[PDB]
Design an enzyme around this catalytic site. Structure first.
Site, PDB file in Angstrom:
ATOM      1  N   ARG A  21      68.052  30.650  12.078  1.00  0.00           N
ATOM      2  CA  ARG A  21      67.587  31.604  13.077  1.00  0.00           C
ATOM      3  C   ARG A  21      66.063  31.779  12.936  1.00  0.00           C
ATOM      4  O   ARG A  21      65.589  32.198  11.866  1.00  0.00           O
ATOM      5  CB  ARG A  21      68.344  32.916  12.829  1.00  0.00           C
ATOM      6  CG  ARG A  21      67.899  34.168  13.562  1.00  0.00           C
ATOM      7  CD  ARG A  21      68.083  34.021  15.046  1.00  0.00           C
ATOM      8  NE  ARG A  21      67.371  35.011  15.796  1.00  0.00           N
ATOM      9  CZ  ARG A  21      67.744  36.252  16.094  1.00  0.00           C
ATOM     10  NH1 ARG A  21      68.831  36.776  15.575  1.00  0.00           N
ATOM     11  NH2 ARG A  21      66.975  36.979  16.872  1.00  0.00           N
ATOM     12  N   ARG A  22      65.356  31.539  14.048  1.00  0.00           N
ATOM     13  CA  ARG A  22      63.892  31.539  14.110  1.00  0.00           C
ATOM     14  C   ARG A  22      63.242  32.818  13.548  1.00  0.00           C
ATOM     15  O   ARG A  22      62.345  32.685  12.720  1.00  0.00           O
ATOM     16  CB  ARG A  22      63.406  31.152  15.498  1.00  0.00           C
ATOM     17  CG  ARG A  22      63.467  29.656  15.764  1.00  0.00           C
ATOM     18  CD  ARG A  22      62.222  28.997  15.222  1.00  0.00           C
ATOM     19  NE  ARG A  22      62.012  27.659  15.774  1.00  0.00           N
ATOM     20  CZ  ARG A  22      60.835  27.128  16.078  1.00  0.00           C
ATOM     21  NH1 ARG A  22      59.700  27.743  15.790  1.00  0.00           N
ATOM     22  NH2 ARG A  22      60.804  25.945  16.677  1.00  0.00           N
ATOM     23  N   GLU A  74      73.350  22.857  17.318  1.00  0.00           N
ATOM     24  CA  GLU A  74      73.055  22.218  16.038  1.00  0.00           C
ATOM     25  C   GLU A  74      74.320  22.136  15.166  1.00  0.00           C
ATOM     26  O   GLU A  74      74.684  21.063  14.701  1.00  0.00           O
ATOM     27  CB  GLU A  74      71.944  22.989  15.311  1.00  0.00           C
ATOM     28  CG  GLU A  74      70.585  22.932  15.988  1.00  0.00           C
ATOM     29  CD  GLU A  74      69.652  24.072  15.640  1.00  0.00           C
ATOM     30  OE1 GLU A  74      69.631  24.423  14.481  1.00  0.00           O
ATOM     31  OE2 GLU A  74      68.970  24.660  16.472  1.00  0.00           O
TER      32      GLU A  74
END
EC number: 3.2.2.6
Lengths: 645, 645, 141, 82
Positions: B511-512, B584
């Site tokens: 998670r960015r 992903e």
């Protein structure tokens, strides 16, 4: 040998000197790292370079000497000495070995004089005596020992007081399986005997040295035998000691050893050791030619002087034998009934031949009209020489010449002849030294930039240009005033001015609750950038939050505060300095650390800044690193610049 | 042969060398793919090229040699050797075949010396003995074998210890239906006998080789017979072995075989095999002319030397027979009562004729005035030669000549004669080597760009231009400094600088906003552990947010999920797979990647686990590492354990 | 080389700064301003987008808001972006320091809806002298 | 030669472009972003101004705003302009 060759040699010398100075600097940058492999490699490169220099066809001796000078001038020689004699070098004896091998290459007369002037002599001697662990150590030891024995009588006598002669004896006695040990032993004995007084010679002889020289001359190695023959014939040259050499029998080996060789056949093998044979050492060998000495000694001396004459022909330095007057003693020996000596002396005189008319000084501005005449003649413009003489042209005037001057005042009609002439003049211009007048080594600068640019030196120098001014020249000034009409050359020098531009190191304080992963990323990356970096995690394991963490801050040069999301809130109203980020930051401020606030992704400063204690509040008004995830490389560049200043 | 032809040959050689170097590079790009058909095709092209080179009428030998050199210099030769001898080549024997055929073409003396220096000799020999499956393999085998037997006595003797002679015998005994096998057999025998000592010759003979040479000399193939006659006459040249060849009867075939041929008639057939015949191999054949030898041996040798004289006339290398002194032995044989030998020797001497006045060095800057005089004379400007001499023109000066210089200093009035002269000078300029002075291989570069541009080389080189500087030249500098007044040529070189511009180990999913720093720390730590680790931040190529990230996951062996807070939470109710962490993770599951969650200290699985989509829900049950900042060494050790299994 | 699409109200200075940094570095970087003469709407911009290899979209605050339901491409930012997509330009959104990938992105017209789900260079003013570099990597590939 | 003063968030892109355009026009023009190092903000900010002959202020939606009632000269644009 021609003046064209004098020029070519001078040119080559200046050229390769410039080159090898730069390469030597690179090798010295490896040495200056003070790391084992780098010192070893740097010294290995210098050693290879010095040997390749000695193998360079004609200029070898001068180029070696100039590099030996450069080593002293750069204190590279001093550094090698220190990095040889220092007890810390015991961490890696191979460092001492490579330093020592380079020192061996570089122990010119002036380098030995330097050693003596700085009183390193006995330190180097003892450290050479410590180089004993292997045949390589032993050879290098005997080499450095023998090199010290090329300095004047007092130095040799002072070194006898070390009893190194017994060390020498033991060294060759231990490892006669190496011919090179026997060479460096026989060399050391030859050198010390040649460079010692009567009393010291007597002391050497008392160490059974005539009998050891018999032993050495009885070993199969001709180079060992040559040095052993010199050593014994040096002893035989002294009245009291002929019986001692007679008792050694070595004189009975001497003439047969010479008889089964030619000086020139010997020279091609001996070359590796003939490198660094020198005028003063010849002056001391000259007495062995005298009719007062044995036929044996005269034969050795004659053979030796033929060998040296052979080498000095190649070097174009036969003048030495005239300077020392050896030519007379060679004539005496050639006339003598000592047929072996007389033959070699006759051969030496055959090699002597005749002198050069002039050896031209590389300081060509100093040239007289006579010099110019000689040059012009020899470069094949004989027809013009009378006009040069009539025009009273001198070194300076040559360096001003233009084709117009040739065309008119020299009357030199062929453009082709002018081209040819100018080519030689350009060559000469490049080749010439200007240090006579160049205060700034602008010449050397230009050479370093590119060798051909030497051509412009004298013009710009005489126009009053110097190494400081060069950046300030316009293309016009260059082109016109400095006459560099070739735009390519102008571009090259323009590139100099295009390119005229550009223990703990770190502790990381951060909030454990949010700045963990990023402080770690910082810590790991800064270790990846070579910085001695610490963080909370690296200092607080299996103990108290002790004064040790503050000692780590005190030991740091630089202090990071990671200003995290929500970091500084607990510092509000922390007047009792209870917060550990407060204690850390306060300590950093008290010890004037180079403080680096890092503004995190998700960080903010508090709205109530007035509530941050006075001793640390200043952090809100300080220069810091913008943190970003994707822009991490620029953020880290901002860290690094603040660290490096 | 004229100096115009010396120039034309040199020119052609330089030209076609440049061309075939480039073509060879293209073929080597096919080889460098290390794919069966590409190696086969590349080697096929090199083979065709080498044969075409050999078939190029004049320059063939030099051009072949220069390409053999280039193959070594490019390590192309080394690559061929490895891609011949390596057991991996068993994937396609046709790869070994084409590599071997090329190696056969490329077996110059220097290439065989390379093989010996790198100790590939016995590896190549054994691998040639493994090439036995077909008559083609057998021919190539016997070829490579015979080519190895062109190296010195010690190498041949060492190769006798392989008993390859019995393999040779078996090979020709298996397939006498192929004349080319019988040729390469008789070749191998001739070569080994010519390149072996008495003891090795005796060992060869013990393999019944005189009787096999009877067999070979009895075959209808004249090339086999020629080699067989050479081989037996090599044996007959030895005292002990004449009776052994008498017992073979082969001497009875020798003179009749010669009588039914003329050297030139044989040469026109044999040329395909004569390509590559060499000085040292001639030096070894020369003893067979001696009056000590049999009439048969002298006759074979004489015929052979006539053949070689024929070929060396074509190549313009008749000087070889003077260099090795064969001319004297030919005179002796021509005077001898051996009428057949005497005739062939007389014919050889007829071919010998007279010397060249000068062979000009392609390094024309090195030319003396004598060389220039000779050139000028031969290009048909004899009346000016005296003026060139008077003007003292040399190799450098030629290359500066403008028509003004001709007009004035040479006094050369006819503009037409000037045009004609300049054409020759341009030709010469193009033709000339500059490697003597061109440190940068600018010449080579220009040739590759276009051959005629060679003309400018010396000018720009002497102006101090080099291969690096070319980028920086203006049209003005080119036109004016470098004298390239032809704008077409300027355009050509402009095109160069006009155009001289423009698997994964681990993929980390995160998670960015919440895994950024930890994902980066993981990336850095795995890169510190040598793993080629890739991330969302990097490997995307400026289209839409698209398949590349999932292709990166497909290429990955292992998939790390930096299971930080609100990572799998965003996947809740993401049934339409809109979330990129979902895409992903789904991709990782579909391609059975070695999936590892890394749990941040504050991470917890979401309360509504049943809302995680079914395709990725399994991640809540997975094997992962709880990341603890305090224990990040151990955590990463655990990560590496999950990676290594 | 490049066309810059930008919002005239909010991205003017940044679009020019991009264009003008790519005048310190030299690059033929078109922009919405200047490229319209004496015509119903010249849209020479679209011809210039067709001639471009690369299409930068400057994404400030308020950049995408009027593109919602603009299926007509009556925003010229839309007509620009649509044209870039139709001619398969190398498309490079540059996200302002204050930019967020919008809520209501599904209301962006189908032909251009992709623009929020696109690879782009996020901006920082504070290291302007390196923030550019990533734009050039997206151009040069 | 030229200092650029601005309120960071609104001189911004224009302030930057001003640097770029003046650098294109040959002036060595620098900005608040560039000239802060290894120490306090003032002590790196202001020194640029004294060495500069010319001082541009980008006047923008929050250029002068934080100067209002800034009698204690706390605002950096105030320190720069003063």
């Amino acid at each position: 040998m021609s003046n064209t060759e004098q020029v070519a040699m001078m040119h080559t010398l200046k050229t390769k000197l410039s080159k090898y100075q730069a390469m030597m600097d690179k090798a010295f940058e490896e040495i200056a790292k003070v790391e084992d492999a780098n010192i070893i490699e740097g010294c290995t490169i210098v050693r290879k370079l010095m040997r390749k220099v000695w193998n360079t066809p004609k200029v070898s001796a001068d180029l070696a000497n100039a590099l030996c000078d450069y080593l002293r001038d750069r204190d590279y020689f001093d550094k090698l000495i220190k990095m040889f004699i220092s007890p810390n070098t015991a961490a890696c004896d191979q460092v001492r070995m490579e330093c020592g091998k380079v020192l061996e290459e570089c122990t010119s007369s002036a380098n030995l004089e330097y050693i003596v002037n700085k009183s390193y002599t006995k330190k180097i001697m003892i450290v050479a005596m410590k180089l004993n662990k292997t045949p390589d150590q032993q050879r290098l030891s005997l080499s450095l020992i023998g090199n010290l024995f090329k300095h004047s009588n007092a130095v040799s006598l002072s070194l006898i007081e070390t009893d190194v002669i017994d060390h020498i004896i033991l060294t060759f006695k231990r490892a006669p399986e190496c011919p090179d040990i026997l060479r460096h032993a026989a060399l050391a004995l030859a050198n010390i005997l040649l460079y010692t007084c009567f009393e010291g010679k007597k002391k050497i002889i008392q160490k059974k040295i005539p009998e050891w020289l018999f032993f050495l001359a009885s070993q199969a190695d001709d180079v060992t035998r040559y040095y052993a023959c010199i050593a014994v014939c040096t002893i035989v040259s002294v009245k009291e000691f002929e019986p001692l050499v007679r008792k050694s029998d070595t004189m009975k080996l001497v003439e047969p050893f010479l008889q089964v060789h030619d000086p020139a056949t010997f020279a091609r093998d001996y070359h590796k050791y003939a490198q660094g044979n020198t005028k003063e050492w010849l002056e001391r060998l000259l007495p062995m030619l005298q009719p007062s000495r044995r036929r044996e000694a005269r034969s050795v001396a004659a053979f030796h002087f033929t060998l040296e004459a052979t080498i000095k022909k190649e070097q174009n330095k036969l003048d030495v034998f005239q300077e020392i007057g050896a030519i007379q003693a060679l004539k005496e020996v050639a006339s003598s009934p000592d047929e072996v000596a007389a033959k070699f002396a006759s051969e030496a005189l055959t090699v002597i031949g005749e002198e050069v008319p002039y050896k031209l000084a590389q300081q060509v501005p100093g040239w007289t009209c006579a010099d110019v005449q000689y040059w012009v003649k020899k470069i094949g413009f004989e027809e013009y020489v009378e006009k040069f003489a009539k025009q009273m042209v001198d070194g300076d005037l040559l360096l001003q010449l233009t084709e117009n001057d040739l065309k008119h005042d020299v009357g030199m009609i062929s453009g082709l002849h002018r081209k040819r002439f100018l080519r030689e003049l350009q060559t000469l211009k490049v080749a010439a030294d200007y240090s006579s007048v160049d205060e700034s080594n602008l010449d050397n600068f230009l050479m370093g930039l590119s060798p051909e640019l030497s051509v412009y030196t004298y013009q710009m120098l005489t126009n009053g240009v110097n190494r400081s001014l060069l950046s300030s020249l316009t293309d016009e000034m260059m082109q016109n005033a400095c006459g560099i009409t070739n735009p390519i050359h102008r571009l090259k020098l323009t590139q100099a001015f295009e390119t005229a531009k550009h223990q703990i190191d770190v502790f990381i304080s951060y909030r454990r609750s949010t700045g963990n992963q990023l402080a770690s990323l910082i810590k790991v990356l800064l270790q990846l950038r070579g910085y001695r970096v610490f963080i909370d995690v690296d200092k607080l394991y299996a103990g108290k939050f002790d004064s040790s963490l503050l000692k780590n801050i005190q030991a740091a040069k630089h202090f990071i505060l990671v200003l995290t999301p929500n970091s500084l809130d607990r510092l509000l109203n922390d007047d009792n300095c209870e917060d550990w980020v407060h204690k850390e930051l306060k300590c950093a401020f008290e010890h004037q650390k180079n403080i680096i606030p890092i503004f995190d992704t998700a960080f903010e400063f508090p709205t109530k800044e007035d509530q941050i204690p006075n001793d640390i509040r200043m952090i809100t008004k300080y220069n810091g690193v913008k943190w970003v995830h994707d822009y991490q490389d620029a953020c880290m560049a901002k860290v690094v610049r603040f660290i490096t200043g």
